[PDB]
């Protein structure tokens, strides 16, 4: 990793756990969803070692330090959605009926069904995701996809719509999809725990993929923020 090992695998579009270390740049970004250094703006160098620990490390709690994986913000059981609610919250997400059990940031906020009268407060930019699944298949489970991403980011995620009101999901070249998402922070009240832009959200997802703590049941290749 410091010299002479796996240089032929750095940036090879295939994640190799043997090369997944900060020294080898998370296998040249292949293990961090194409995010070079998710901690690039983090002021303390050893934060990634404390990212995975299930405890608050205040020195690593800044937005630049990826909120110490929300362990300072969500200190107790509220860190995760109840496993008994997994199917229920995915089935009832954004169905136009307020489901109180799902009405928490860790469960996906019920896809905002309990906050229809609160105006959208979008983060800057668009979250772009390459998923190795065709658009039709991806949209067949779109509620599950958005609910899970909303639960992970602890905020509300939705498909960016075009002028014709259609979801901005494009074919990837037959082999996958290029998914465009917006982040609605209308329920994200602020210390800090809210992504101000799409790149911040992409870096956080890259940091989870880097420490092997991203459990998203979709063939997600890469993430980026775009204006």
């Amino acid at each position, epitope marked *: 990793c410091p010299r002479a090992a796996c240089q032929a695998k750095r940036g090879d579009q295939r994640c190799d756990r043997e090369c997944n270390s900060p020294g080898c740049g998370w296998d040249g970004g292949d293990c961090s969803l194409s995010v070079g250094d998710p901690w690039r703006q983090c002021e303390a160098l050893q934060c990634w070692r404390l990212f995975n620990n*299930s405890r608050c490390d205040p020195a690593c709690s800044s937005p630049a330090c990826l909120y110490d994986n929300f362990d300072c913000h969500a200190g107790g*059981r509220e860190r995760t959605c109840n*496993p008994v609610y997994e199917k*229920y919250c995915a089935d009832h997400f954004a169905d136009g009926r307020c489901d109180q059990g799902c009405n928490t940031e860790e469960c996906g906020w019920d896809g905002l069904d309990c906050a229809s009268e609160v105006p959208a407060l979008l983060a800057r930019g668009v979250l772009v995701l390459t998923v190795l699944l065709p658009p039709e298949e991806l949209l067949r489970s779109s509620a599950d996809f958005l609910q899970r991403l909303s639960a992970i980011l602890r905020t509300s995620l939705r498909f960016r719509l075009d002028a014709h009101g259609q979801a901005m999901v494009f074919p990837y070249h037959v082999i996958g999809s290029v998914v465009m998402l917006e982040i609605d922070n209308r329920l994200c009240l602020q210390n800090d725990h809210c992504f101000p832009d799409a790149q911040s959200a992409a870096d956080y997802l890259g940091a989870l993929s880097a420490v092997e703590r991203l459990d998203f049941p979709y063939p997600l290749r890469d993430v980026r923020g775009e204006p």
Partner: antibody
Amino acid sequence: QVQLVQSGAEVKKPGSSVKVSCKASGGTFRTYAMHWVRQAPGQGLEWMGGIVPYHGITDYAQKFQGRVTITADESTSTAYMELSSLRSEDTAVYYCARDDYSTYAFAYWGQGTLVTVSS
Amino acid sequence: DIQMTQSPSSLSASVGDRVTITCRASQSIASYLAWYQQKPGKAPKLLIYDASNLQSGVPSRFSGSGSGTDFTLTISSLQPEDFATYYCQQAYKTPYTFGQGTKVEIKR
């Protein structure tokens, strides 16, 4: 102090139904879950399903689909497990288990209810 | 389902021995793993929750470690009241699943 008290031992003929109850007391956490775990004689532990009485949301193990019904009465902090079309292989001790404010793991357990299914 | 594999299934040890029981999950469960103790004719008892948190009232000679797919229950200075069956349980995704159990007997 949290305490879980279950209904008494049951004896049933094959094809009959059983409904077991579990009363929780001493709890302060509103969104606690009540689970049903069974243990056949000399065997391990098997989760059947669970409920959060405050929200009424339930989840079951697929192998118990159609035969198990889990309900609760939030006002009495009581959970129920109903198991239908009883077979001799359903003979087991049925435990009620509850989590707490700090984990989803089974922090509290009832004393168990033996259900014997036989001719 | 997530399959939980415990090792050993049976263990003979003496009072004062340092005992290790391992639990392997079929897929990663992060740190969402609990350890239970069960004695004959009694209900299980929670010892450790979420891989490494010792339940209050449980002696400090019990400790849990691991993350991902591999977990360890360590009993330092095994005491007479520790002879029992131990189970690991993933609390990560439903259906909640348990290991097959490790029966700990006293050598004599």
